């Protein structure tokens, strides 16, 4: 966490976005805190003013002034609070319009052509997205506008009473107290230095304190059968009292440095006031500015008095306000990195993956229900080659069943096919991305009603569009045999969490009953056939049929077998096989 | 979190464990407490005494009396340093003391009698106790002495300042002040309820937004085959536009409530003030009191002025010390429950463990070099039965050969071995508990030398007794061919974390070296060698024969078949087998 040049540039480069324009709301606000920011001062010298003439209305005994110097402050209190609960709304309202400005426009890249699943898994610069795009972004808008807000009012504060204080005290009166604070504050600043070596030994041996403990409870069992008792007493009896004696020397230092710190700075600034204070009154032939009455000199006194308190807690309120930009820094870097990171991943490129050219060489075209790989040679980005020059195409009417070991490397021809995954050498074709809908085991089902759930791609007005009416969904559903979810939840209507509410047979009969509706020409099946009888399977493997749509198969069943054109058998060591049907079985084993 | 009688009785209970005595160190510290305590309260108001003097010094135009009172404090500061830095070195060596003492109470009981794996492993009440007996106990210290140094100050300042007001201002001075701050506090508390309505529906808000984007995280895959872009982007704005719209009306009434606030509980108290203090001055008949010089009735105005506001901010500080007791009463909590289940654990009782009677019902003989099962029937602590009666007995020089399926009910059968888990019927024989030595697959090394290693369950006195020199120990890690490790550190006197500087092979061989050392008469070998020659392999096992220990064998491997005297096999459904030797195999197929 640096502050530099690049840090201001990072900065402004930001807020050019979250106040676009001149004329925005963002910018009423800025006015509208401007504003009250120099009325709040005012208030306050008022108050001041005003409170000691009520003192001596009383410390003269005469009820009149009292009386006409309390209803003053009694008629005027309203008009106080109205600014200082105005300024707050005005900074709440400010932070609260950055949140949203910054998140809608990280949001409108975010989700923009794959991007949130390559960041996710195809780029290792980020990691856990779903924390820095929600509690980065509010903490920044609150910090970014805590500084604005804490090193302007003192700032105000002290312009004002270094210049109500150089005609009543003098020229040096102020100067000769900032002069003290200032060397004071070193000299404290550099004595304190030992307290900051000795807070990273207490953490380290409370490290090996918990460490110590916690391998004792994992290795419990292993050393309970020869008396482990003695021994570990020893150990944690060890490092416990290196910790409660270092904790002696730790607060005797504490002890010594205090004294010495109250001393200094806490019984002499009050007296430095004094003097610098006292100065024109103690001179009897000072130039014409008191030969007044005593009822002159208290106010005269106590005003400066409690001025010089006021310019005294503005350093240290501003010297402390200094620590915000050190933490700002690194939020800001953090945002930085990610609009970096989203801007290249919208192009192109992308480094530090999960030999020809990694990442991307070939070409693709758009056809229709048709895919050919000639000499397409597919390969993870990493360096990793999975098989050698491929060569195969599927027609329409036609069907792909995968048989052979685990899923190795034909999760990376699956990634490959829907784009995704890069293309390393060889043109290909394939339709326009949304129709290779590919249904895993446990199908996915998102927080909605049922309408959502079988159109879940698609909303309603896009329904509308369709000319579909419910009694067409309810024949959908009655295929898969659904037909009793209906009044499950009351209908349509029903806004529940379909992860425990459905069966997993359900779910998958759910999934195929979204294939029907959609129609899609290209569709891929990975083992979410595991619990379904015998007549569904082949009732939808025959509507498929009759409606005419390409079909890969991952099952590897018997029956399966039977109900295919092709098939691609693999060895794990790369090889692909690709042909008409064997009468028997594939001439290699099983 | 509730303050009850019961929560006194249980503080109490446990505060007579950390001041035993009536002379002990922690009694030092409870006076040397007390005793500044009290001088704190006259300093301050031999501070605020002194100050309207210095100040009436100047505001006539008098020097004599101004430097006079100024040496007054220039000679007197140092003094009132040593207090405050001294009432705070006595509050934290009291914690520290508190610390101690109630950590070796707790690990006294905590390391008796394999209580430490009872309470991990055959108990639920407390989970992960590492953390209640390191973190706990420092809060609970640090807690119970913040409240005793909390509510003690302001109960002495309004005790003092109740009792000088009294007599500058009159008996209902104080009494009218006290009753107006008590009934403001009343009405805006009772004002201030909805803010606590608000502030669940922010969180719930804020982690249906979160949730929502972990779930977008989590299956980017399988919404990005088919336009999963335009939904999700909908949902997150739906979640995101509620939370934002809720923002706005929390932030109005948070705006209105400040307004109200201030006028109420800032410029009325004020008022309030003024009204009191300058009753007795706007008198002229009064008793008295005041026929006095300006110079006097300065300092009597001033010196009231600043009692009354130290009065009521003393009220404010002993009502927010309120919510101590709130906090503490968890950790009280906490730590009887603790206390209570160590003190069952150290008798044969619990509850809620990971038909005969379950706790124990049986009985235990110790004898020497032999082991009988005579209807002992073991079973897991939970209602299941893993076998019905048993019955086989093993002599000294024979062997126990494991043969069967994985692990299941043997682990049970290994940790009733060792004592540890109970006994669910029969009588049964063994030794005393030190000769049953189980080493894992991967053998436990702790944190130190090499002696250490090898003598783990002694010492060095311990070594001494028993008249080994370094000579033998290496004769003895000879003869597992680890010699070359003297020299790998130094030798004796090399500190080192050894689980990442031995391979598994190495930890093996130590582990056979330090059973060798150690000859105890039964061990148990359970798939510890799975990377070892067979040089070493039966070079072990004839010194072990040679030297007469019995041995256990998990093995399952045909050399281990062949150097073995008998055999358990069982089917997994319960059933174990007792023989010599069959000529071929065990007449049950594999």
Redesign the interface.
């Known amino acids: 966490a640096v502050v530099d040049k690049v840090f201001f540039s990072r900065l402004i480069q930001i807020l050019k976005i979250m106040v676009p324009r001149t004329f925005c709301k963002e910018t009423g606000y800025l006015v509208l805190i401007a504003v009250m920011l120099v009325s709040r001062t005012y208030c306050d010298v008022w108050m001041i003013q005003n409170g000691t003439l ?2 001596s209305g ?4 005469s ?1 009149k002034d ?1 009386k006409r110097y ?1 209803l003053n ?2 008629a005027a ?2 008009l ?3 600014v ?3 300024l ?2 005005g900074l ?2 400010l932070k ?1 319009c950055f949140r ?1 400005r910054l ?1 809608k426009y990280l ?1 409108e890249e975010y ?4 991007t ?2 390559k960041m ?2 195809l780029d290792n610069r980020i990691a ?4 820095l ?2 509690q980065d972004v509010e903490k920044f808008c609150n910090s970014v506008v805590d500084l604005y807000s804490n090193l302007s009012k003192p700032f105000l504060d002290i312009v004002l009473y270094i210049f109500k204080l150089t005609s009543a005290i003098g020229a040096q009166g102020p100067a000769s107290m900032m002069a003290y604070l200032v060397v004071s504050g070193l000299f404290l600043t550099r004595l304190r230095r030992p307290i900051g070596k000795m807070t990273i030994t207490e953490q380290k041996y409370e490290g090996e ?2 460490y ?3 391998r ?2 994992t ?11 003695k ?3 020893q ?3 060890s490092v ?1 009292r290196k910790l ?1 004696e270092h ?2 020397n730790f ?2 230092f ?2 010594s440095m ?2 010495i710190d ?2 200094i700075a806490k ?2 600034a009050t ?1 430095v006031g ?1 003097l610098v ?2 100065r024109p ?2 001179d ?1 032939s000072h130039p014409r500015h008191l030969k007044s009455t ?1 009822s002159e ?2 106010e005269d ?1 106590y005003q400066s ?1 409690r001025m010089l308190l006021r310019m005294s807690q503005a350093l240290g309120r501003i010297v402390l306000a200094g620590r915000e930009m050190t933490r700002l820094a690194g939020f800001t870097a953090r945002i930085t990195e990610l609009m970096q990171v989203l801007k290249d991943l919208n192009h192109g490129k992308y480094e530090r993956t999960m030999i020809p050219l990694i990442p991307g060489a070939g070409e693709i075209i758009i056809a229709d229900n048709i895919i050919k790989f000639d000499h397409v040679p597919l390969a993870t980005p990493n360096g990793d080659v999975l098989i050698r020059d491929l060569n195969f195409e599927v027609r329409s009417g036609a069907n792909v069943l995968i048989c052979g070991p685990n899923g190795c490397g034909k999760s990376s021809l699956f990634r490959v096919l ?1 784009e ?1 995954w890069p293309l390393f050498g060889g043109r290909l074709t394939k339709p326009e ?2 129709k ?3 249904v ?1 085991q446990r199908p ?1 089902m ?2 909605g009603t049922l309408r959502d759930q079988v159109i ?2 698609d ?1 309603r007005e896009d329904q509308k569009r369709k000319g579909i009416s419910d009694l067409v969904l309810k024949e959908y559903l009655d295929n898969v045999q659904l037909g009793h979810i209906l009044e499950r939840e009351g209908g349509w209507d029903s806004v529940q969490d379909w992860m425990d509410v459905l069966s997993g047979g359900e779910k998958q009969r759910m999934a195929m009953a979204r294939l029907f509706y ?1 129609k899609p020409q290209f569709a891929i099946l990975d083992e979410c056939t595991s619990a379904v009888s015998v007549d569904v399977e082949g009732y939808i493997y025959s509507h498929c049929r009759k409606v005419g749509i390409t079909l890969f198969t991952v099952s590897h069943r018997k029956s399966l077998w039977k109900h295919h054109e092709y098939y691609l058998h693999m060895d794990g060591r790369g090889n692909y096989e690709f042909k008409q049907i064997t009468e028997d079985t594939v001439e290699f084993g099983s």
Chains 1, 2 share one sequence.
């Open positions: 009520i003192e009383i410390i003269g005994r009820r009292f309390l402050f009694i209190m309203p106080i609070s109205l200082n609960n105005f707050k709304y709440n309202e609260l949203v998140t949001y989700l923009q052509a794959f949130y699943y996710g898994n856990n997205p779903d924390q795009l929600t304190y918990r110590v403990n916690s004792l409870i290795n419990s069992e292993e050393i309970a059968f020869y008396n482990g008792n021994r570990e007493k150990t944690v009896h416990f409660v904790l002696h607060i005797l504490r002890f205090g004294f109250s001393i019984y002499l007296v004094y204070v006292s009154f103690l009897l005593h000199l208290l006194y008095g829907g995704l991305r949304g290779l809908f590919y895993p996915y998102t927080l879940y791609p909303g959609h």
